[PDB]
Structures are given as structure tokens and as C-alpha cells.
Design a protein around this nucleic acid. Structure first.
Lengths: 210, 125, 288, 210, 135
RNA sequence: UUCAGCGUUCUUCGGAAUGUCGCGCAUUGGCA
């Protein structure tokens, strides 16, 4: 039983809008603020969004059982990797995807050029009936942002580690094509998992060939 | 608690007194577009103020607030209605006391007062 | 474009900003920085400053260049470009034509759309009009604005004008036949109500005598500037009363002081060819 | 589950204006600036703008049901291609059009030509009752610049992928005939499409025919 | 931005004070019309503001923190144009000498910084806007 | 006749988000 870290980075290729809540909108300010970790007041990519997007894309690639009403009905590879909660037959998740924080490198390259971390994109909604717009402000994340994604893989069945990492590779390739966060259908969310560093944090497992 | 009192209740009552009905006309005929432009400038400075975490206003935001006062004067010169609104709500005087205090809190209550002015101006229409 | 047409770009350049060869009869439009650095290198910058201090009113660049006797090829290196000129008087003023980022000559489609909207009135989302095709800069020649109010007079306003479009409609809202008929009707109204007043004035008699108006002048539009108050805006007499009232309200000096209604409100171009020309008139053609 | 990636060129036929607020403007300068990528500080055709324009044009082309007060109720082909949100009938979005960034080719062309990618256009409103003009300055994108637009289509219903890509091509043609961005009824927003390459990045679908 | 004589600083409130100082009611024929800078109107002011506008746009598009040589020559041409316009009309001459703009352009040239040029542009904004306000 | 331009506007008006989900399940409970 070993624990392997996949710490790397995420290069946003367009705006990234992972919305939030709990703050009332000052009149004329951002209507849909981006989620920020309150202590640093920086936009972040919650690990829940990453894990959900990876799981959804991988399930679509592998195939969904027709009439699937719950997440626990996915293919056994998906349940083995991302976790399942059935009645009595519960499978632990070997993937633990943490919140990806704003990188210090991107923070420095944005402090240079005097560039704000987020971009208040200005949008509208032309109705189909009266053809009247409706202003909206969305707090996207700028293109230069890099996020320190941190994933832990737990090796439980040593025989399935290779196939599980092939699944992870397929899912991250699907994510390189698919977006992260909301509004991805309208230009947001594009990313690329360019930077990686995989090694065995705990145990004796071989992490050189992964 | 800016100056003299100046609060959100002051905003609601001043919009009430300056409201006159013939159609509804406020501050001797101030359209909502001019107020929205002023609030847009307020938002532009307020976003930078909010993003910074320190409690003391920086030099950049202070210069932007002086610019905001100049823009207020320009808008008053452009249209008499905006001039009467600025004089009846004393917004530029609040900008001055915000500059004098050099505190983020005073700017935040100033922005709250401006937003209250906008909200009550739209509500009474 | 039967008459010289100038679409301003918001930049007005003075006499001292550009060179004017009177004998060669051509205007060298020059950029500032190239001339400034040329004079700094050649020691003519202090001379230019002393020239400006000596004569405040008239500071023609060409006369200064002749006084310093600088090389003509040394003139060409700081000159942005050259244009053929037409003057009735060195030139006083100059209005530049509209140039996009690339720098080609073009009339914006917004001017055409606004003129069409004004003439047709008497919404407008269906008529989508785009910019006209690029034109080579050689057609850009400098003309003069001349006021004809019972007597011709040259004016200091010199203007860069063109030498004498893709559009889509929706069938229900607009029709080509209807819009062209309305254009022709508006032109006929302009001729009947206001052009006759200028025909009757002695300055108008001089204008027609020289063949200033085109013989043909169908579809005629007032695209650019300098066309007049009869365009850019009713019974004939009531219309004249409204124009006189608005001019009294706006222009306190020329119209406010004088109380009597003029013969025609408002009371009011030379080219090297003997034919006279008028500013802004254009002939259009529409193809489906 | 294959993702088919469209990459192509959007070359500006005329000046392009796509407004965006939140920028302090100097007196007499550009009153309504164009949208900018904050990082590159260059004009950009947002993916939202392209997607909204294409959907609007396509839905107008096939037809609009009377009293259409919402975007969810529409021609079902548009719902399949671009998405839907109707209660109990959510349809996933098969087209994810992203931001069109300023290409290096056109940027270097302008750099060699000593041209700025934007331009300031002078206009004025002539009230005709008094013939009184009120001037304004609109930012436009210099003609000849090029953007690289990058769409991704998820192949969910294999049977109708040909019809869906035909609809995409028709929408692209509709965007050809019309403008994009600000007031194009007065001459802005003209664009041109050059389809660079269509391929299947992830999966085993055949992209030769498309 | 810079410093004038008698220890007075250059700022936007200084522009307000300058425009106020050169304001005379100057009633004529029983009508109260405001004159600024001894006969200066707003048309000359808008012309000067447009002259500033061109260079401001050029510097605002560029990302460089140091003033380019092209913008330096822009500013030299600006100095020449200011001198010419001041020589043309006495009212513009009084305006230029009272607002010390001709010295300010020299200061921004010496500083060779985009931020300083932006501050000078803001100062000229204050001048024109405050002249519009007091009128 | 000569010379010279001059003033006017510098953006305006609206739209400032909307609709929907508002935790669910499993165990604890109730029944048996």
C-alpha cells in the first residue's frame, strides 16, 4: 500500500469561471463571482470540480449503463478509481484530487505587467422575443493563470495500478480537450495539464515508469 | 458615519425629497444613465480597492479617487441635473473626506452610500 | 461622387504642420516627429523656433524651408505623402480624410447609413451597410470650402476630399425600390425648397454660369461634410421659419442679432479645372 | 466517445468592435473600447460572442416559434448542438467554441508594417431637429488581422454527426453573411473563415469525411 | 508630477485652483457670462486636449514601462505645437503660461516613464474638465 | 482688396442579470 503524488500545474488557455456564492452583489459589481479561497483572496480550482470533470469524462468515454440514475452504477473501473458508495459494497476512491491554488509563478507574472488576477468579462443576453440585452458581469480568470494541481493516488491492488494510470491518462487527455468549470460551452474552461511530477511519497512502490 | 448626518438613511431621504412627480423626475431631471456611469467609475475604483487586502488606501487608489472627483466635476459641468444631484447628495465632499481619512473602511462606506443612492433612485421610479 | 467629398477623421492640421508648394502647386502632408528630428540633427530646430517667434500669425513651413534652403530630397524624407491641391485664394487650414489602421482610403459605412436614415425619415436594424472598398490615396486631393451668399468668397477651411459597398436588407422591413424612391423624393424636395433660393442669388447665377453643377444632376446623396443645413436635418415657409428660429437660438452672432427673416435660410468649392464643384454630392448605384 | 477538434482562421474583413466596460477612458479618447485579453493586451473574439451569434443566426435561419420567451425552447437541433436547460429535458452541449486569440502571423505582419492592431474611429450623432452633433470614439480592430478559432465537438449520437457538422458549417456560413460584435449594421464586424484542419484528437472516430 | 515656483505642487486640485484664479465674472451689458484665462474658450482647449489625446492613446496601447523614442518625438512635436498655438493667440499664451503645461511636458520627457506621462495626461484632463465646470 | 479662420458639441439613452436545482442518499429513525 503506497501513496503517490502527481503534483504538477494547469495552464488555462482561456478564461476560467468556477462560480461561487455567499456574497451579495454590490450594485453594478460582478454578478457571478469566481470562487476564491478566503485567506489568500485568489481564484482557485476546487478539487471537487477537477474530480467531477475527470469522472464524468472518463465515464462518458468508457460508457454509461443505459438508465443510469446514480454515480455508483458506472463501469467498475470508474468506481475502482474514483470511489463508490453502494449499499454494503462500498469501494474506496484511490484518487484524491485537492484544490488547485493560484501558482506563485503566475502570481509574480501578474504582479508584473500590473494585471489583475481575474477579468470582469462583460456579457449580455439578447432575448428571442423582444431582442433586448441584459447585462451580466462574470469574474473569469485570466489566460496566464497556472494552478498547482495536487493529486494523491493510493495503490491498493498492485496489478491494476497500470490500467488505472492509463485511465487517468485518458481522463486527463479528455480534460485537455474538455473544459473545467462553468461557462465552458461559451469559451471558458480550456486548460492543459502540461506540468507533472509523479513520485512515491509513501511506501516502496516503483514510480519511475508511471 | 462619514460627515454631516451622512448615512444610507440620508441617501433614502434625500432621494425622497429630490423626487418630484409631474412621469417621475428626480434631482431636476437626472436620467439613470448618468448615475450608472458614475457608479461604473465607482465600481472601477472599488474592484481595485476590494482586491487589495491592506486596510490603508494605496497611492494608486488615492490618485484614482482624485480622478473620480475630477470626473464628478466634469459630469456636473456637462449637465445641470448631475450638478444638482452631486450638490444635494454631497458625493464629492464624501470623496474628499475619504481622501482625508486614508482608510479602506471609509471608502467602503462611501461605496455603500453611492449604491444606496442608486438603489433608492431606481426604486422610487 | 460627382462632387468632392471629405469625411473628417477628427484631426485638423494647421498651415505650419504641412508643406505647400505654390509654384509646384502640391501639398506635402508631413508627420511631426520626422520633421522635428530632422531639424534637430541639421540644426534647423532653433531656426524653426525663431521663425515661429518672429511671425506668430503666418508660419508657413514651405517659406521657412525656402529661407533655410534645404534640399528637396531632404524634404521628401520627412514627408508622409503628397497631394494635389486646389486653391481660390499659401493655404490656411486643412482637414484630413478618415484612415483606418492600415491606412487605406475608405468611406465608413456608418456615414452612408446615417445619411440614408436621415433622408429616409419623413428601428433601421434591417438595413445592414458595410464599409466601402479601399481606394488608392492618389484620389485624395485638397479642395477649398467657398461660401456663396449673393457673392462668392473663399474660406480658410481647406479639406482633403476624394476626387470626382456591401449591403443587406430584410424584405419585409425595407425594399430597394422604396428606399431609392424616397431618396429621389428627398433630393427633389431639397431642390425645390432650398436649391431654388441659391439659384436666384447672384452668386448662384455665377455658379451656374461656370457650369458648376453637373448637367445630369436620379439617386443623389449627401455623403460627406460641407453639404449644408438643408441636408443633415414640412411646408416650405414653415420649414424656413423653423430653421431661422433654431439658428437664432443656437448662433447668437450671425443669426441672433439680425431679426429679419433672410431670403433663404441658411444664407449659404474650387478646383484647378475651370468647372466649379460642390461638396458632398454623390451618385449611388445598387445591385442585388 | 471521440472529440473532433476544429481549428481555423478568422480574418477580419473590416474593423471589429466588441465592447467591454470597466475601463477608465480619457476625455476625448476611446469612449467604448474593444474587449482585450488582459494578458496579451490584444483584441480577442470571445468564444461566448461567437457561440451566441452562431446560435442566434441558426435559430433565425430554421425558424423561431411564436412567443419564444426563452432560449431553452427552440429548434431541437440547436438544443442538441449548443445545449439546453429546460426543466426535465436538459440536453448536453455538443459544441464548445472558445476564444479566438490574435495570431502570431498577423501580429508579426502588423509589427513589420508598423501598424497598431486597433484603430480609433470618429463618429457623431447628429440630432436632426436642431442639427446638433455629439461626437464619440469607438475602438475597432485593424483589417487584415487574424484570429485562431478552436471548437471541440463531442460525438454523442454517431448517426447524426454528419447532420450536426452540416449544421455547424451552415452556421459558419451565416456568420460569414452577417457581422460579429458591435454595430455591424453601420459597417463593423465583418469576418472571414478559413478551415485549417478537422481531426479526431481523442477516440476512434473517422474525421476524413468531415 | 512636478513642481512650480513658490513651492506649489502640480496636482488636479492645483488645476482647480489655477482655473479658479483665472476666473473673472466680467459682466457685460447686464449679462453674467464667465470668461476663463482672459478670453480663452473651450474650442482651443479641446484642440489642445486632442493633441494630448493622440500621444496618450499611443502610450496607452504600448506595454513598455519606458517612453519609446517615437513617443519622445511625439512629445517634442507636442512642445513645438504648444509654442506655436501660444504664439498664435494671446489667450492661449496666458493659459499655457499659467498652467505650466509647457514645463510639465519637459518634466515628463526627463522622467522617461509611461506612468509620469499618464499622470500628466490626468493633469490636463483636470484642467479641461475644471474649465468646463467653472463655466 | 488682403489676411485669418472661429465657435458648437467629446458621447448619449436603455438593458444592470434572469430562470432552475435550494442538498440527496445509506446507516441512526418508522414498520415489522
Amino acid at each position: 500500500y503506497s501513496k503517490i503524488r502527481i503534483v504538477g500545474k494547469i495552464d488555462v488557455l482561456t478564461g476560467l469561471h468556477i462560480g461561487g456564492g455567499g456574497e451579495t452583489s454590490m450594485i453594478g459589481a460582478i454578478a457571478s463571482p469566481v470562487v476564491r479561497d478566503p485567506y489568500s483572496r485568489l481564484p482557485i480550482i476546487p478539487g471537487s470540480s477537477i474530480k467531477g470533470k475527470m469522472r464524468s469524462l472518463l465515464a462518458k468515454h468508457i460508457g454509461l449503463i443505459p438508465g443510469q440514475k446514480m454515480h455508483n452504477q458506472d463501469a467498475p473501473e470508474i468506481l475502482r478509481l474514483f470511489g463508490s458508495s453502494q449499499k454494503g459494497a462500498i469501494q474506496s476512491s484511490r484518487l484524491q484530487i485537492s484544490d488547485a491554488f493560484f501558482s506563485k509563478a503566475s502570481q509574480e507574472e501578474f504582479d508584473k505587467k500590473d494585471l489583475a488576477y481575474t477579468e470582469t468579462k462583460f456579457e449580455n443576453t439578447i432575448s428571442r422575443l423582444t431582442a433586448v440585452a441584459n447585462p451580466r458581469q462574470i469574474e473569469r480568470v485570466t489566460r496566464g493563470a497556472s494552478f498547482d494541481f495536487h493529486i494523491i493516488y493510493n495503490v491498493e491492488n498492485i496489478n491494476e495500478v497500470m490500467a488505472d494510470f492509463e485511465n487517468i491518462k485518458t481522463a486527463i487527455h479528455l480534460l485537455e480537450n474538455d473544459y473545467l468549470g462553468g461557462g465552458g460551452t461559451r469559451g471558458n474552461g480550456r486548460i492543459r495539464f502540461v506540468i507533472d511530477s509523479i513520485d512515491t511519497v509513501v511506501g516502496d512502490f516503483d514510480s519511475s515508469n508511471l | 458615519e462619514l460627515a454631516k448626518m451622512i448615512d444610507l438613511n440620508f441617501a433614502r431621504k434625500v432621494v425622497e425629497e429630490n423626487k418630484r412627480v409631474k412621469e417621475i423626475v428626480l434631482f431636476n431631471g437626472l436620467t439613470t444613465s448618468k448615475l450608472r456611469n458614475l457608479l461604473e467609475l465607482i465600481n472601477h475604483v472599488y474592484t481595485k480597492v476590494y482586491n487589495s487586502d491592506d486596510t490603508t488606501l494605496s497611492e494608486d487608489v488615492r490618485d484614482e479617487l482624485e480622478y473620480l472627483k475630477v470626473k464628478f466635476a466634469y459630469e456636473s459641468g456637462r449637465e445641470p441635473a448631475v450638478r444638482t444631484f452631486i450638490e444635494k447628495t454631497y458625493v464629492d465632499k464624501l470623496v474628499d473626506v475619504v481622501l482625508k481619512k486614508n482608510t479602506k473602511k471609509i471608502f467602503l462606506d462611501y461605496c455603500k452610500y453611492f449604491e444606496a443612492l442608486v438603489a433608492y433612485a431606481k426604486f422610487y421610479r | 461622387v460627382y462632387g468632392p467629398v471629405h469625411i473628417g477623421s477628427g484631426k485638423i492640421i494647421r498651415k505650419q504642420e504641412y508643406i505647400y508648394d505654390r509654384r509646384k502647386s502640391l501639398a506635402h502632408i508631413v508627420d511631426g516627429p520626422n520633421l522635428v528630428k530632422f531639424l534637430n540633427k541639421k540644426g534647423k530646430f532653433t531656426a524653426y523656433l525663431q521663425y515661429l517667434n518672429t511671425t506668430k500669425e503666418r508660419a508657413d513651413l514651405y517659406t521657412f524651408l525656402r529661407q533655410e534652403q534645404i534640399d528637396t530630397n531632404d524634404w521628401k524624407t520627412f514627408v508622409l505623402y503628397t497631394e494635389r491641391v486646389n486653391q481660390g485664394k499659401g493655404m490656411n487650414d486643412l482637414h484630413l480624410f478618415v484612415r483606418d489602421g492600415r491606412g487605406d482610403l475608405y468611406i465608413p459605412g456608418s456615414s452612408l447609413k446615417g445619411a440614408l436614415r436621415t433622408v429616409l425619415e419623413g428601428a433601421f436594424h434591417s438595413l445592414s451597410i458595410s464599409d466601402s472598398l479601399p481606394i488608392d490615396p492618389k484620389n485624395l486631393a485638397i479642395y477649398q470650402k467657398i461660401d456663396i451668399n449673393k457673392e462668392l468668397k473663399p474660406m480658410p477651411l481647406y479639406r482633403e476630399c476624394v476626387n470626382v459597398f456591401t449591403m443587406k436588407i430584410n424584405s419585409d422591413d425595407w425594399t430597394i425600390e422604396k428606399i431609392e424612391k424616397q431618396i429621389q423624393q428627398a433630393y427633389l424636395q431639397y431642390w425645390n425648397k432650398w436649391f431654388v433660393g441659391m439659384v436666384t442669388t447672384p452668386g448662384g447665377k455665377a455658379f451656374i454660369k461656370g457650369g458648376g453643377l453637373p448637367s445630369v444632376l436620379p439617386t443623389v446623396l449627401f455623403l460627406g461634410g460641407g453639404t449644408g443645413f438643408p441636408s443633415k436635418t414640412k411646408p416650405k415657409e414653415q420649414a424656413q421659419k423653423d430653421i431661422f428660429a433654431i439658428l437664432q437660438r443656437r448662433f447668437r452672432n450671425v443669426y441672433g442679432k439680425m431679426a429679419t427673416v433672410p431670403k433663404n435660410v441658411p444664407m449659404v468649392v474650387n478646383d484647378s479645372t475651370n468647372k466649379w464643384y460642390q461638396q458632398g454630392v454623390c451618385l449611388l448605384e445598387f445591385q442585388p
